[PDB]
Amino acid sequence: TTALVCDNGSGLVKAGFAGDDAPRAVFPSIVGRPRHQGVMVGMGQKDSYVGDEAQSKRGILTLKYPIEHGIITNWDDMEKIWHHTFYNELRVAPEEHPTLLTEAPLNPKANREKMTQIMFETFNVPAMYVAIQAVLSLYASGRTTGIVLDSGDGVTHNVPIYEGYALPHAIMRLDLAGRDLTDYLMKILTERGYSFVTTAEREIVRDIKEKLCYVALDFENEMATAASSSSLEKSYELPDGQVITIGNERFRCPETLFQPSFIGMESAGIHETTYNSIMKCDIDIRKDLYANNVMSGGTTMYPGIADRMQKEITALAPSTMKIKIIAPPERKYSVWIGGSILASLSTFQQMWITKQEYDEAGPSIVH
Amino acid sequence: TTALVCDNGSGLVKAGFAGDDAPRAVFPSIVGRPRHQGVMVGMGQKDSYVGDEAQSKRGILTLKYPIEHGIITNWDDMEKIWHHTFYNELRVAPEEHPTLLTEAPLNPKANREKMTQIMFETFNVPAMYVAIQAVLSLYASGRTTGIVLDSGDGVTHNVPIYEGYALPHAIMRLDLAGRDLTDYLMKILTERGYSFVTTAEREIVRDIKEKLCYVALDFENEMATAASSSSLEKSYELPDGQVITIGNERFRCPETLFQPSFIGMESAGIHETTYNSIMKCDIDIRKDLYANNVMSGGTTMYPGIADRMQKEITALAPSTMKIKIIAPPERKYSVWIGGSILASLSTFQQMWITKQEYDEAGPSIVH
Amino acid sequence: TTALVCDNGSGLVKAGFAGDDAPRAVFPSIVGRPRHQGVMVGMGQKDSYVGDEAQSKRGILTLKYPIEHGIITNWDDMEKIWHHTFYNELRVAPEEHPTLLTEAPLNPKANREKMTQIMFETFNVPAMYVAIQAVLSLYASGRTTGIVLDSGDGVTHNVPIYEGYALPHAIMRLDLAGRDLTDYLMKILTERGYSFVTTAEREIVRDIKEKLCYVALDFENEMATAASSSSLEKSYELPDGQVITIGNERFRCPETLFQPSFIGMESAGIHETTYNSIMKCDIDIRKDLYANNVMSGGTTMYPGIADRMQKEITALAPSTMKIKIIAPPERKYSVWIGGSILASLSTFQQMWITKQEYDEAGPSIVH
């Protein structure tokens, strides 16, 4: 049997077998219990709706993302995510396949152990391994050097890798993008009188965060032309018939990635965390970290990136240095195409942690 | 044995066993004591005549509807309604059947308790349950979403239901239609010189409220053509031989449902209470409340509804929204066909409150 | 001349010159047009009655609060509020005094601009400034740190301030209390058979919301003693002679502030919004947000607050932390005593926006 790559998204959990095209299942991670009393008599209602069904049944449930700030809320809901994914999307039994699971870089111990341990006893997989989402994006882009960005709602990361070794002393985790950008967009859309305070309605905010937002070339000059009469406004239509016109806030929300002072948080922008991680690496290596700046994750899919990022880095970086920023299409599925390449390779079959070895070793094998 | 669905009409009490055709007994709720002295010597006269016999013996009695403004006048007369219904119409003993009783939405406490308690000790039914008349109209129309209208003489209601949960925060009770429309018709028929002030004669007013009245497409334009010489007049014949010709007031009386300022009451029309209840529901749900607007109750059987209601809602509702108003034939028996479907279903047999459980629990089981 | 502090209440507009005792004018914000035709011949009737005269002429008018959900309905009625206030209560010309106006925190743009702009051209004030009602309550209590609560009919707010800087990332606006508590009280008083559906009569509901309601120590245990025979009932007398006896609903209505699930809204109680705003502030600052919890606004004048709030916060907050909740008398006039202190200080005279500067700058000076 065929191995299964299942990505523990922050979004947007992604699932598909090993090779060779695209993921089979992608869905918004949400679990939602019903906040109102039923009067139908069937009864016909589920105890907890997962996505996609919880995104079709908005407004009668209370949506709860099971992974928040890069860590799982409880494994009771997480197990339901897994069960739903394997059985009613992929249509496969875990006993049939070796699996490949993903994690986030700088995640607290003992949450990789507890995960691995529960998943082996609950789903009875014959072998498993847990890879960080950032490392996998190297394979997806066909690179062997560069700084890797796993940016999902709501934890971004900046990991530098050099042919083909990782540098522990320069790894940066920012809790900045993207769920706090969702919350910030909701705070500056209230300023235009649209009240979307409720949990369900927050998903609609997320959808306009995808579609209508853009990044400026320079903030001050976009603000200048905003003061002018020329329309930057785009009109969105809402499920109850309402028409929302956003303009100024449209470029304000993504610009936060370069200026976190908009949220009021002390942390520095992607601009400077890129530079400061490069300048924590040895002198000879710095040469090839420039021009292997590879963006990844769905929250980097705004149009004005990477050429904003490019212009800003080129201004702070040493003169006459070659800087190219690598941003392909499909960054949301980058991780999955990474994992797919990995699990197909020899000899990594023998790098998987198998059940008998796990049973003897216990949680200490993980690291 | 076969369960019995007995509807506590405002009209028009309705009774018939569970399934599958139509009600067996429908009658005008009136009790009437004799207002004149008897000289026949038989004597042969009843202490209180119920309907139908009190509608055949008009003019020698004083008709008193036992339910007024959605609440029962006294249980002394109500028990006679029940006794008459079970014994001399349906021909059944309550000890033979589990019953299903109806109520009105937003009815004061403790009037469901006192009812339930008296009915168990007086009629000795083996089990019972009390459903609100509005919820039952969902089943009758085969829907699972929509705003439900229980409109009888003289309390209307507007209850929003979404698949398959009820929304408590948007429930509206209007004391507007229909008995006040009966009283208003009597006030604008006196304007044409016909004096029908007495209690018995008020039933005749109710009968012309059924048959001859109609709703306009637009008030102002119907008023315009009323000023013209073309006849809108219909000639009714009265039991003593009199011929009554009504025209202008013919469309004025039902138009009150869209304009309560005709009665002088502050409350807003069905038009606006429909809109304002929809706009008290969550944004995603509003989409399916439009086009599941379901009218019910006999007082909605005027010809110009629903296409008046349609035109008015479409003008106030957001542009490009799909609005269909659902109004089938037989709306007066909607409630009964609802109840019939309910009481036949498994597992609702075990939702009935049985006598032993009631005896242990007391009136606190009701809610 | 003496500066004038005029508070844009949600209630309850408040007005009085700068220093040193109490407001001169307080009145219920209502404007009401006459819903019936006049037959007196004088004629003697006003086009629109404002409060107090619209609270003496109840039942012949249709009361409309000009500010609803924290935003003004139209400036046509708002200007009449202002005109009435300055001229026929305060007896002062706006050209004589610099004014100080108030607003609500998280109010949509461009409603501070449009207000400021209209007020300068209509009333011709020589200078003005607009302060949010929450910030002013710090001065009133003589504090320089703490979370400030502006709670009026029907928008509450939770703003954290630290010596002497404001924290934008933790500001919470709840549309929960108090006008929806008025509407909820009307919905659970109909349950006891008293029908107060009309606009005028809604004011009477508001008056019993003030006087007779109380907060429980614990809901479940107050509900227990409610099931007991001991009287919690208080008897109110109504203008037409009616005696109303409320008990259970008496503690149910204010308890909604800790449990919004009673209205069916998804939002969390003051308990948790207090905690969750504190836990969105930096670690060192959290220490002094506890014990500077300052309540304000008239809708916090229920007797069981703050010691309900105290017991609930102490249960959720970390162990051995000092928590004191600051609730002085006169919370309804807190805002005014705040404003009074502010406008008297040097150098804040030079913080006022003066007419010549406004004329040059235009609406862009506001922020």
Swiss-Prot record, chains A, B, C:
Post-translational modification note: Oxidation of Met-40 and Met-43 by MICALs (MICAL1, MICAL2 or MICAL3) to form methionine sulfoxide promotes actin filament depolymerization. MICAL1 and MICAL2 produce the (R)-S-oxide form. The (R)-S-oxide form is reverted by MSRB1 and MSRB2, which promotes actin repolymerization.
Any GO CC annotation of this UniProt entry: cytoplasm
Modified residues (N6-malonyllysine): 57
InterPro entries: Actin, Actin/actin-like_CS, Actin_CS, ATPase_NBD
Listed EC numbers: 3.6.4.-
One GO process term, biological-process aspect: actin filament bundle assembly
Tele-methylhistidine: residues bearing it: 69
Modification Methionine (R)-sulfoxide, positions: 40, 43
Molecular function in Gene Ontology: actin monomer binding; ATP binding; calcium ion binding; calcium-dependent protein binding; cytoskeletal motor activator activity; hydrolase activity; identical protein binding; magnesium ion binding
Major location category of this protein: cytoplasm
Residue numbers of N6-methyllysine PTMs: 80
Pfam family, one: Actin
Subunit composition and interactions: Polymerization of globular actin (G-actin) leads to a structural filament (F-actin) in the form of a two-stranded helix. Each actin can bind to 4 others. Interacts with alpha-actinin. Identified in a complex composed of ACTA1, COBL, GSN and TMSB4X. Interacts with TTID. Interacts (via its C-terminus) with USP25.
Protein name: Actin, alpha skeletal muscle
Organism: Oryctolagus cuniculus
